[PDB]
Amino acid sequence: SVSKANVPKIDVSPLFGDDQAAKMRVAQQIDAASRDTGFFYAVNHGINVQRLSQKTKEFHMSITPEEKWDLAIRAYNKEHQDQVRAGYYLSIPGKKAVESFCYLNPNFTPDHPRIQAKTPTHEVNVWPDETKHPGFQDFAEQYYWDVFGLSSALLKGYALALGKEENFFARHFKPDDTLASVVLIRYPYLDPYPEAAIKTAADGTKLSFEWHEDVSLITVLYQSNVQNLQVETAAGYQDIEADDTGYLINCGSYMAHLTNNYYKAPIHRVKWVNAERQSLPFFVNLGYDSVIDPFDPREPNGKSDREPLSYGDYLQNGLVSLINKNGQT
Ligand SMILES: CC(C)[C@@H](OC(=O)[C@@H](NC(=O)CCC[C@H](N)C(=O)O)C(=O)S)C(=O)O
Numbered sequence: 001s002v003s004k005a006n007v008p009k010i011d012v013s014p015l016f017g018d019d020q021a022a023k024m025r026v027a028q029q030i031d032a033a034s035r036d037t038g039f040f041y042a043v044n045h046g047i048n049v050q051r052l053s054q055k056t057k058e059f060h061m062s063i064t065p066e067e068k069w070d071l072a073i074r075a076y077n078k079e080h081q082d083q084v085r086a087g088y089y090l091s092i093p094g095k096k097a098v099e100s101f102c103y104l105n106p107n108f109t110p111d112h113p114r115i116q117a118k119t120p121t122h123e124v125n126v127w128p129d130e131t132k133h134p135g136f137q138d139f140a141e142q143y144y145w146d147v148f149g150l151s152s153a154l155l156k157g158y159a160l161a162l163g164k165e166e167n168f169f170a171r172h173f174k175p176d177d178t179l180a181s182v183v184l185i186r187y188p189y190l191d192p193y194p195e196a197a198i199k200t201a202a203d204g205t206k207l208s209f210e211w212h213e214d215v216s217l218i219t220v221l222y223q224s225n226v227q228n229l230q231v232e233t234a235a236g237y238q239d240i241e242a243d244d245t246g247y248l249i250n251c252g253s254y255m256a257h258l259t260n261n262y263y264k265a266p267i268h269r270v271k272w273v274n275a276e277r278q279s280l281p282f283f284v285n286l287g288y289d290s291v292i293d294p295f296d297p298r299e300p301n302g303k304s305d306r307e308p309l310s311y312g313d314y315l316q317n318g319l320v321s322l323i324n325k326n327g328q329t
C-alpha cells in the first residue's frame with residue numbers, strides 16, 4: 001500500500017501571544033515540518049471549524065441550478081466577463097463532479113482603488129440572495145477575517161523560523177489589499193460515479209485533481225474527516241491523514257521562491273473518493289505590489305541568485321498556469 005506521511009500536530013497558540021521564547025519553540029517546529037514533508041496540522045488555532053462546516057453545508061445543499069448560473073464565473077457564463085476568480089464554479093453531471101464557490105477580500109468594494117483601476121486579480125464578490133440564504137454572506141465575510149487572523153499568526157511563526165523578525169511576511173498581509181481567497185468546495189457522493197470525472201495517475205491511483213504545487217505564500221486548509229490528500233516525498237507519494245479539528249498548512253511556490261527552495265512548495269494531489277465531503281482552503285496571498293527580496297537561510301551571507309517578483313505578477317500568471325495544467329475547476 002501507501003505509507004503515512006509525517007504530518008506533525010503543532011500547537012500554534014503561542015503565536016497569538018507575547019511570550020517570545022515560546023514563539024521561538026513553535027517556529028522551530030514549523031522549520032522542521034517545512035524541511036521534511038512540507039505539511040503540518042495547526043492545532044489550538046481558535047477557529048470554530050464545526051460551525052464553518054455546518055454553515056457551508058447549509059449553503060451547498062440549498063443552492064439551486066438557477067442560482068448557480070446567476071453567480072457563475074465567466075468560464076461557465078459568458079455574460080459575466082468581470083468574474084474570473086470570484087463566483088460559482090459549476091459541476092457538469094456525467095463529466096465533472098466537483099463544484100465550488102470562491103470569494104475574495106470583502107474590502108474589494110466598488111469604490112476600492114484597485115477595483116476602480118480594474119487591476120487584474122481584484123474583483124467585487126458576488127453573493128446569492130439574502131432571503132434564499134439568510135446569514136450566509138455575513139458568516140462567510142466573518143470567516144474570511146477569522147482565517148486571516150490565524151494566517152497572520154502563522155506568518156509570524158514562518159518569519160521567526162527563517163531567522164527574521166516576526167512581521168517579515170505579515171507586514172505585506174493587510175486587510176485593505178490582500179489578494180487572499182476562500183474557496184468552499186463540494187465533492188459529491190455519486191451512484192454511479194462517472195468515469196469521465198475520475199483521472200488516473202501514472203502509478204494507477206484514481207484522482208480528482210492531479211499533482212501540483214500551490215499558487216500561494218502558504219495554504220491554510222480545513223477539510224472533512226475523509227482521507228484524500230497525498231504528498232510526494234523522496235520515498236514516493238504518501239497519504240496525509242485527515243484531521244477535521246485542525247488546519248492543514250503547507251507552503252506555496254511564492255515561499256519556495258523567496259527562500260531559494262529552503263522551504264519547498266510540496267508537490268501533492270487529491271485522490272478520488274466516492275464520498276460527500278468538503279474542502280475549504282484559504283490561499284494566503286499578499287498585496288498586488290508586495291515584493292519580498294529573495295534570500296537563502298542555508299548560505300552564510302543569506303544572498304540568493306533569484307530575482308525579486310511582485311506578488312501580483314506571480315498570482316495572475318500562476319492561476320492561469322494551474323488551469324492550463326490541471327483543468328478548469
Ligand atoms: C486546496 C484543496 C485541496 C482543494 O484544491 C484547490 O483548491 C486547488 N486550488 C486551485 O484550483 C486554485 C483556486 C484559486 C481560487 N479560484 C482563486 O482565484 O484564488 C488545489 O488543488 S491547490 C481541493 O481540491 O480539495
Ligand SMILES: [Fe+2]
Nearest residue numbers: 212213214268
Ligand atoms: Fe493544492
